[PDB]
Paper text:
We determined the crystal structure of GbGtfC-ΔC at a resolution of 2.25 Å from crystals containing one protomer in the asymmetric unit consisting of residues V26-K735. Domain IV comprises 110 residues (223–332) and is much smaller than the corresponding domains in GtfB-type enzymes (usually about 170–180 residues); it connects to domain B via two loops that lie adjacent to each other. The crystallographic B-factors for domain IV are on average higher than for other domains, indicating that this domain may be flexible due to a hinged connection with domain B. Some of its residues hardly showed electron density, but since domain IV superimposed almost perfectly with that of the AlphaFold model, we confidently decided to include all residues of this domain in the crystal structure.
The first half-reaction is α-1,4 specific cleavage of the substrate and results in a covalent enzyme-glycosyl intermediate, which is transferred with α-1,6 specificity to an acceptor substrate in the second half-reaction, leading to isomalto-/maltooligosaccharide (IMMO/IMMP) products containing α-1,6 linked units at the non-reducing end. With a limited hydrolytic activity, GbGtfC releases mainly maltose instead of glucose from amylose V or maltoheptaose substrate, synthesizing a main product containing alternating α-1,4/α-1,6 linkages instead of consecutive α-1,6 linkages.
Author numbering: 26 to 735
The structure:
Amino acid sequence: VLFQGPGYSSGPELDNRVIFQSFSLYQPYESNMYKILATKGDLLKEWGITDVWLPPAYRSFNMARYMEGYAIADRYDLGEFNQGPNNERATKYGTSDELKDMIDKLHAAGLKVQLDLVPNQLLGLNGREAVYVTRVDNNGDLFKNPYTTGLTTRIRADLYLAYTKGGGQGQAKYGYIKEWNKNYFNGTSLQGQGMGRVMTDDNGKPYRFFGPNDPRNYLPSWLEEAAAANKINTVDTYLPVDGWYAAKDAATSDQYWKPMLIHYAKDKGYLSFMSQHGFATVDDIINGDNAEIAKWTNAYIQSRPEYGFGSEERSYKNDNTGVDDQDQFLFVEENGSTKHNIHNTIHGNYEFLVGLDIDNSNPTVRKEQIHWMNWLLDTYKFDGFRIDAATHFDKQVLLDEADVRKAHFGNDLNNHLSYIESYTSKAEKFENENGNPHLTMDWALYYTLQDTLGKGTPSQKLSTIATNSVVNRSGSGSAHAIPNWSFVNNHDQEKNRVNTIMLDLYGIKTGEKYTTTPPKSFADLYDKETEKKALAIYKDDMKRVDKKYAPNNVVSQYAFLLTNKDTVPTIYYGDLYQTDASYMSKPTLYYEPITKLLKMRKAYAYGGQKITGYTSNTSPETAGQDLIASVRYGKDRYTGVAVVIGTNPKTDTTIKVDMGTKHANQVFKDATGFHSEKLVADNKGVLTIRVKGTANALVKGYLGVWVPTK
Ligand SMILES: [Ca+2]
């Protein structure tokens, strides 16, 4: 008879929680965020923040676009080891010691903290192995080049040298797995090593070198000296095109190490490139200093598609996410079979995103993940986890994560939140089937807010904000709402909008079919100057009236988000603060209105919820098209709030907003500051509200947020 597992239940208790997403991608590499955030506990308390989502604190691949901590080179180095640029301890955000102290101070302020947990992938390991690859999309289905030739790929169980082995000193010291390798990955996003990277004969047989004596060797005439000598650069017996070998005087002479491209017959273009770079003859190379050899012989490698992305059939989708997740190799065996199970995700497919995709179906990997989570709670005292890419790996890991929390904190779920990053309703089904061990992300309301209120001149009925949510708030509300965390904006969706600007600047349309023209690559073109330009554009756009890129009616969105019954709302860092400035140095035009909306919620956001649709002059036919009221009735006469919203600047109507009988003959005041009229509720607690349409930077249509005196 076991009693381990209430699960989350949506109700007034859980509705008390508010998550602050503490970070964006565009924060500067300043190694100071922890030191600063350590001081903000009281401020956060004022707003009714209960939980702080912290960035992924792990060591970043050094060439990561944002250095943010999702491209993980070492999963156990959170600013502890000397593995940063110039062997610094600090991550983007600061040292482990600073992280420890900051968590200490934030607990001291009565807040909880979640780490951004990243089970899906690693990126940027230093050591290569040989794998077989099949060219597949994000779902692991054979890739069909839909934006180029439309041909089904013939890259099927082909030989490839990938970066698959490493993991840093953290892993090596604290890990269950001590080193990652190819066996532990379902595959990798294209690494631009090229399909001709292994040295082959004229038919297609790879060259092999196990040892000097070995009868399993298969080399050409010329390498037999280096073979007997045992001086060939190899990878798992295979010969890489970039590899060097003892050219003249094999044994007992290590001053004649030379690029083996010299007599690699299949490449007919190298010797000629070295011609037009000083080294005119076969033997001019065999002499010259390897500084200027290496320099030039390398730059050749990069010019050849057989040795780069040019042979790997990139999708060239140029998705505004900044990742073409159809750019994958599945790790297969020689016959094209695979040990890797890629259909255990919440999606059912969609195993692949970016980087070295972790085989979360491998029982050793699964033990490694439990070990990892354990070590994180134990070492850092996080209270829970924001689960990154939760819908793109073996979902067992999610259930294991819940057990890790149970083992740590018991049935005290509410004070130990976990919330999964989700953009599909399959997350809802999964959660409900398993007793709701996590908060599911309200993706649906996010897109619904963007279409009704985010868009200038909305083409979608504003009333849809009631229905088009993981929680259906129409009529009386949801009797049994799914436990959920909701948002108006986040680090990804912002980055999307910025990338859209960059694409515009680069002259690239996402999804364009390149039949007759050369395809263009966002990835190849990415540069910091263009990013700087795009950021400048983005911020200006927020401040303008007829916004082009940034969303309209940010305050209207938050006013709805922060007054909804049955949800944990999220406050996004970059909605309150300029995204690319020093951490919490510069507020936005939305800072004042939102922080106020926060004090309001904390004071007034109690009781039943009712959403009434209205007619306006602008829509006399269909009620709720452009005008609505989202009412929290209050628990007592002194709580509750009427959120009135319209989407048309012209609108000129007077509507009746019923607050219930307990709000009879009571003074209501707009908490937003937008209207300074003092309304009095009638006999029955109805408000007569004159709706004067407007258009500036904050509002397009109408916002009123009417709260009683106390
Ligand atoms: Ca995956």
